[PDB]
Design a protein around this ligand. Structure first.
Ligand SMILES: N[C@@H](CCC(=O)N[C@@H](CS)C(=O)NCC(=O)O)C(=O)O
Ligand SMILES: N[C@@H](CCC(=O)N[C@@H](CS)C(=O)NCC(=O)O)C(=O)O
Lengths: 201, 201
């Protein structure tokens, strides 16, 4: 199993998840600017869109999109309970949270990480992200975990994106429930090991 | 069970899925500007983001996010084969397709349907949509279905988004494979029923 990454990108989420399940895997770096794998392979052969993450299974089939990859990884080690069982309401609430993170929260950041973007795109995206952070802050005031009863791929995915505001001029002091949440998650051995393997600490 | 809609919006996809399965539900119109249900209720008490779709279950809980709502609808009637059984490779490929549609394709259109948006933002959004349409057009040449070998919720979801370009100045005659795909899907009675219920025909 090979996970295709770029350090600190949304690919960190499945990186942490594989460490949480103990799966055998290779973490392979991609140069997002040239779309080339560190091995020199053309990454567009693996993911035609050129984006990370991509997960190549032992069969040689490649899966894309964080929500699908993260569920796949959780489901291979049910004892880890990183996703609820098939046919529970909690399983749909998890998919809901993964779709919100990928479709709303992630995409809020894109102008802030585009040097091309206007002075006013950058400020409006600033606003959208700070709005998301305010609602996430109050949601996690009342609960330890982002989805259902216990630590899940949804917490892993949120945790990774809560590492982004500090790089685009947003002070995470305003969101102290998010602070503590990131605090607790960062102490997990899986999380420190992924942060170290990607060169982020 | 109530599905909160705005006519022709992405809430048409679960509306069509529910007519496919024959589940009992109320279709409930929302004025997205005033966040007011056609009943006069505050929509923010149902979905705090104020977006459609939202699906209130009989158990009384509310699901948001198309990918989650659409899988829930499919799995209420496993019989109808609108999604593969959970835990199969087929299931994760379907979740990958729903994530791509929700996070990449849907998001390209946002500036074209945002009341505020500049001419600049609309032109950029038009370019991103046409790039997606060219890719989808080539993918659907030698396919009949978007996901797997069967009509799925991913086909319903893509179908609805493919009805948007003609409303925002894009000429769909440049995408003949999408033209044929939409042509076939438009004959399903679920589609007529949903459109008529939303008052679009
Ligand atoms: N919808 C995709 C998004 C993947 C994505 O946008 N990845 C970024 C890194 S955070 C990337 O590879 N960007 C490079 C590019 O788009 O050229 C998912 O959820 O996996
Ligand atoms: N990621 C959400 C997005 C839903 C969405 O953007 N819905 C639109 C209609 S297509 C909406 O309610 N817009 C009103 C608003 O954003 O205020 C999903 O997949 O359910």
């Amino acid at each position: 199993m090979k996970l295709f990454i770029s350090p600190g990108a949304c690919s960190l989420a499945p990186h942490i998840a594989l460490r949480e399940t103990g799966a055998a895997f290779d973490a392979v770096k991609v140069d997002l600017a040239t779309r080339k794998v560190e091995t020199g392979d053309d990454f567009l052969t693996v993911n035609p869109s050129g984006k990370v993450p991509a997960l190549t299974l032992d069969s040689g089939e490649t899966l894309t999109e964080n929500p699908a990859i993260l569920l796949y990884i959780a489901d291979q080690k049910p004892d880890a309970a990183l996703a609820p069982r098939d046919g529970t309401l909690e399983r749909y609430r998890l998919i809901s949270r993964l779709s919100f993170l990928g479709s709303e929260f992630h995409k809020a950041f894109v102008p802030l990480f585009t040097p091309g973007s206007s002075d006013e795109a950058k400020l409006a995206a600033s606003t959208a992200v700070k709005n998301h952070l305010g609602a996430l802050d109050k949601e996690l005031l009342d609960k330890e975990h982002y989805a259902g009863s216990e630590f899940s791929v949804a917490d892993i995915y949120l945790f990774v994106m809560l590492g982004w505001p500090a790089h685009v001029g947003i002070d995470m002091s305003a969101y102290p429930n998010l602070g503590a949440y990131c605090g607790r998650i960062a102490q997990r051995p899986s999380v420190g090991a992924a942060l170290k393997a990607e060169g982020l600490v």
